[PDB]
Design an enzyme around this catalytic site. Structure first.
Site, PDB file in Angstrom:
ATOM      1  N   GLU A 154       0.808  -1.191   0.000  1.00 17.51           N
ATOM      2  CA  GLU A 154       0.000   0.000   0.000  1.00 17.51           C
ATOM      3  C   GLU A 154       0.864   1.274   0.000  1.00 17.51           C
ATOM      4  O   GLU A 154       2.052   1.243   0.336  1.00 17.51           O
ATOM      5  CB  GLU A 154      -0.887  -0.003   1.236  1.00 17.51           C
ATOM      6  CG  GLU A 154      -0.150   0.002   2.587  1.00 17.51           C
ATOM      7  CD  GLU A 154      -1.168   0.293   3.681  1.00 17.51           C
ATOM      8  OE1 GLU A 154      -1.972   1.258   3.637  1.00 17.51           O
ATOM      9  OE2 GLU A 154      -1.221  -0.474   4.667  1.00 17.51           O
ATOM     10  N   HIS A 206     -10.437   4.684   5.023  1.00 18.00           N
ATOM     11  CA  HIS A 206      -9.598   3.929   5.945  1.00 18.00           C
ATOM     12  C   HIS A 206      -9.913   2.436   5.864  1.00 18.00           C
ATOM     13  O   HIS A 206     -10.168   1.825   6.909  1.00 18.00           O
ATOM     14  CB  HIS A 206      -9.746   4.417   7.391  1.00 18.00           C
ATOM     15  CG  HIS A 206      -8.520   4.243   8.217  1.00 18.00           C
ATOM     16  ND1 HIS A 206      -8.539   4.009   9.567  1.00 18.00           N
ATOM     17  CD2 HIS A 206      -7.193   4.304   7.855  1.00 18.00           C
ATOM     18  CE1 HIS A 206      -7.308   3.917  10.005  1.00 18.00           C
ATOM     19  NE2 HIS A 206      -6.465   4.091   9.004  1.00 18.00           N
TER      20      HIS A 206
END
Lengths: 90, 110
Positions: free
Chosen positions: B73, B102
């Site tokens: 990520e 999130h």
């Protein structure tokens, strides 16, 4: 240092557990309340050293399904990569 | 080089070059420069850098899993201060996803 307390007997869902972590760990208001999110906060948010005191762990497992153990596992994995975390399971 | 930190530019860069743009540093590299996450001092110690490149374990199986596939990520839309809620996720076989909430939900972008 940072102190976090989980009172296992008050945990009646995986959502309660994430809301308690949100407060105890001073997590962002956007906190996603999921494992990916918790790991993200443990590794790029939360203050160290951190003492996590998890009372009544077994009782918190009952209404979280696999949730409580999955959560504990993320914190153990954080400590395994160097995060300064003390976990107290009572 | 100018900072590339948008969903689209980082996705096209990853897809095209198979590596992140140079304004990304992993969390351990950041830490070596003195990043202290709870201080939100990333831009002081590493001007123009964003956290990116770390392993994404995909523990809840919200991204498609396959033997041999690893995920990583990187932060999207960060400039400075505390980190935000946007992340790009990319696999070892170059599948690209994002999240803006999130990690609650993910959208496939490549």
């Amino acid at each position: 240092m940072k102190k976090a307390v989980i009172n296992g007997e008050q945990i009646r869902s995986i959502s309660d557990l994430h809301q308690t972590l949100k407060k105890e760990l001073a997590l962002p208001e956007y906190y996603g309340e999921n494992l990916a999110a918790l790991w993200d906060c443990l590794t790029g948010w939360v203050e160290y050293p951190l003492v996590l005191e998890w009372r009544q762990f077994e009782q918190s497992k009952q209404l979280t399904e696999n949730g409580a153990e999955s959560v504990l596992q993320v914190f153990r994995e954080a400590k395994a990569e160097g995060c300064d975390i003390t976990i107290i399971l009572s | 080089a100018q900072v590339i930190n948008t969903f689209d530019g980082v996705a096209d860069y990853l897809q095209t070059y198979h590596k992140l743009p140079d304004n990304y540093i992993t969390a351990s590299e950041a830490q070596a420069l003195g990043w202290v996450a709870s201080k939100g001092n990333l831009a002081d110690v590493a001007p123009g850098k964003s956290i990116g490149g770390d392993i994404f374990s995909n523990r809840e199986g919200k991204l498609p899993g396959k033997s041999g596939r690893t995920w990583r990520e990187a932060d999207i839309n960060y400039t400075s201060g505390f980190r935000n809620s946007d992340r790009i996720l990319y696999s070892s076989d170059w599948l690209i996803y994002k999240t803006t909430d999130h990690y609650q939900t993910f959208t496939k972008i490549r």
